[PDB]
Design a protein around this ligand. Structure first.
Ligand SMILES: COc1cc(-c2cn(C)c(=O)c3cnccc23)cc(OC)c1CN(C)C
Length: 113
């Protein structure tokens, strides 16, 4: 494993703890959510992100954050605001942006000196 992979696995593990039922663990299928693919053109889930870390597909934390935000935005676009999925996506989004804030990344960058 590489330092970036170890860092991204840490961030991913903390985010996945916020989803105990595994609603974001794997892709949303049309069988699980009628007409999902008709609406969501760029799907994302934690499993796809985990596979990207394992394959060394992330060149930056910014790219990892963008995939995470896409996952949450898709749930908030597809599901209405009073649903379990919309609420959980909003919760996960705020938790990830707190964990990977510019302040926290700058402190990590300074510690690499
Ligand atoms: C990855 O699997 C699942 C996804 C969803 C699921 C997720 N997201 C993000 C959605 O937007 C969504 C929207 N509508 C309907 C369903 C979902 C639900 C599941 O069942 C209740 C499973 C099934 N597993 C927990 C075993």
């Amino acid at each position: 494993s590489t330092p970036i992979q170890q860092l991204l696995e840490h961030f991913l593990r903390q985010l996945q703890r916020k989803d105990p039922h595994g609603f974001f663990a794997f892709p949303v299928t049309d069988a699980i959510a009628p007409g999902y693919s008709m609406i969501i053109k760029h799907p994302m889930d934690f499993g796809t992100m985990k596979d990207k870390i394992v394959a060394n597909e992330y060149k930056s934390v910014t790219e990892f954050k963008a995939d995470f935000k896409l996952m949450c935005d898709n749930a908030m676009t597809y599901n209405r605001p009073d649903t379990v999925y919309y609420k959980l996506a909003k919760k996960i989004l705020h938790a990830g942006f707190k964990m990977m804030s510019k302040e926290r990344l700058l402190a990590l960058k300074r510690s690499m000196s």
